[PDB]
A paper describes a structure:
Rhizobium etli, a nitrogen-fixing bacterial symbiont of legume plants, encodes an essential l-asparaginase (ReAV) with no sequence homology to known enzymes with this activity. High-resolution crystal structures of ReAV show indeed a structurally distinct, dimeric enzyme, with some resemblance to glutaminases and β-lactamases. The active site of ReAV, deduced from structural comparisons and confirmed by mutagenesis experiments, contains a highly specific Zn2+ binding site without a catalytic role.
On the other hand, Ser48 is not always hydrated (structure MP2) or the hydration may be incomplete and even different in the same crystal structure (triclinic crystals, not included in this study). In structure MP2, the side chain of Ser48 has two conformations: one as in the hydrated state but with H-bonds to w1, Lys51, Ser80 and another water molecule (different from w2/w3/w4). The second conformer of Ser48 is rotated ~110° and H-bonded to the N atom of Ala266 and carbonyl oxygen of Leu264. Except for the absence of the w2-w3-w4 water triad, no other structural rearrangements are observed in the vicinity of Ser48. The different hydration state might be the effect of differences in crystal vitrification prior to X-ray data collection. However, in our numerous collection of ReAV structures, we also see cases with incomplete or absent (MP2) water triad. The corresponding crystals were grown at different pH, detergent and salt conditions, which would certainly affect the protonation state of the key lysine residues and, therefore, polarization of Ser48. It can be hypothesized that in the crystal structure with no w2-w3-w4 triad and with double conformation of Ser48 (MP2), the hydroxyl group of Ser48 is not polarized and this structure shows the enzyme in its resting state, between catalytic cycles.
Residue numbers in the entry:
A (entry chain BBB), B (entry chain AAA): 3 to 352
Write the structure that this text describes.
Amino acid sequence: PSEDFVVTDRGGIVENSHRVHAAVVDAKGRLLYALGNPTRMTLARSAAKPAQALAILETEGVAGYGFDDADIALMCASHSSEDRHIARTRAMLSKIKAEEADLRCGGHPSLSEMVNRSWIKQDFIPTAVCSNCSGKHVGMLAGARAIGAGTDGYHLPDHPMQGRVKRTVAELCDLDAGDVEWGTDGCNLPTPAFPLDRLGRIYAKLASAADGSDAGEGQSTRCAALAHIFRAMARHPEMVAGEGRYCTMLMRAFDGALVGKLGADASYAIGVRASDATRQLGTDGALGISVKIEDGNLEMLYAVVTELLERLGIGSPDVRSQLASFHHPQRVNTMGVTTGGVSFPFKLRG
Amino acid sequence: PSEDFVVTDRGGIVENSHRVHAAVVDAKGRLLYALGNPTRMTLARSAAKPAQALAILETEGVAGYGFDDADIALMCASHSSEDRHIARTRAMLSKIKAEEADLRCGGHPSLSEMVNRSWIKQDFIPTAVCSNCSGKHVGMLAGARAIGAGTDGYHLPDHPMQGRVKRTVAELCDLDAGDVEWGTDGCNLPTPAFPLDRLGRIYAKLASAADGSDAGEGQSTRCAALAHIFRAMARHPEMVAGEGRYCTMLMRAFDGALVGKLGADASYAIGVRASDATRQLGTDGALGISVKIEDGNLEMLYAVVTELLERLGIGSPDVRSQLASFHHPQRVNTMGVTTGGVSFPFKLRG
Ligand SMILES: [Zn+2]
Ligand SMILES: [Zn+2]
């Protein structure tokens, strides 16, 4: 096994070290570059949300509800529970004539410290429409209603909406169903685990579909729906996360060149449209990147993901400098003195 | 290298894994048991506070200020900034005729979520007197004043109070000065790094001194002051951390049998008085334990420390059941469904 780490220091003395796993793949999933174990069996968590949004959009009758691109971005979101996220959740419930009591997700403290601070100040108790996954849950309810399934158990494995998700995830990964494992997420849905490179593969396919659409190429229904998802995420990145959030700031900086999505417990996935940068990396099409920090540290994840974009030449120094606060996280003590930093003793291998 | 981990799962699928280092030492620092690398060079951070309290108590003239056992517990503390912590900081400043403006530490969000909630509700901005290190800083101010040194720079490495700290830390570790490295902490004091087993050695010497004092043995002023520090921490565990904090709950459960202290970025140190448990572990005196979680995760630290006490037979099932919430942290989702767990595949070696 390779020894790929992100390391924090205090005055040059090792504080913490964190093992890094990464895969960089082409549009067919061929491995181009790796850190750590690029095939590590990994819980995709919320980084599977674009695959789940594809299952929702490929459910016949869902188009009749009139979900717009910001609604689709919400289906793809781990949102901050800003007022705009909660309002959009309730508007999406209205489009399908369902209620908050139909949701099978629960409230939680906001993923945004600033939102959560304002909640704590007002003694706000979050409810199901406040879930960071509320968009995905409304989409799954929409799919259940559309096929005339019945809604009470839309979240259970035996429900056709979860059968459709499970098949769709295996298909995008190019895996047999038995090579995908399932647990239960914080939002109370089935959540998949598969080799980390296949999370890269999903995002390479999303960006590849965007390339095919933009170029006016004939597309399958699946390619057209993947291109729609890419467009929705890139056009409404504030729905995918929120103000100050990595995914939002990343996708704003890149202005359509890529989409990126957080997985809880420090996974990350990026889908990169074909560019001079992807060609210099040795592929003629789109690219996928997937990352896992073995110990689950989010601050380290955003630092490593930003470092990998710099290493791979994706964007310009100017575009990437919008993410400087995440790339080289502040180590300023209570008296304003910088006490250390973050280092990246890992080596991309081809 | 040994492969000693604590692991979290979702539905039996690996989520995160965390590398554990631990040393179990006798009263002289002889290694009895280990996990990972027991000599890992480690920033002791707040777990060095008892060594710093010894430097303070050994400073000529400090005895004249009349610091009591709760004051000494606060010198040893990473407190929650409860009102009683702030009050005792102010009382200690008054004993040395100093003001809050003399402190060279800064305010920070409370180490207690409940305290920080009350602060957020009242728009409270924490100041120097609120620092989790405020007791250590008052003690260092006391030392500087007591020997007629300048007070303005009591926190600077060239100040005689910090020369006393540096020498004292190396002496308790049985190390030459050059074998201890120094950085700057969050509170803006010099902070040491030394092999992890020597953190265990410090706490074994604390517990050994307590045993010597209790038995009415003639003691040096250093051994008597180590005994006093142990007794202060054991008698005032609420000063060392606060309500609901691991160190307070651990030391209350053990009712004098041991002292325990958190280091920032997930170190831990325990000093165990001679007992039936220490004798079953193959030593005739007191014992020291030191732990580091390589990636810095606090929840995993408390889980591991509790599991290690169970494996070492320290306490009874009844004593250790007070720590159940830390030993096997809850993995219950937003809908009340248990989605995962914490496992300890590490193996103690002799
Ligand atoms: Zn979810
Ligand atoms: Zn401190």
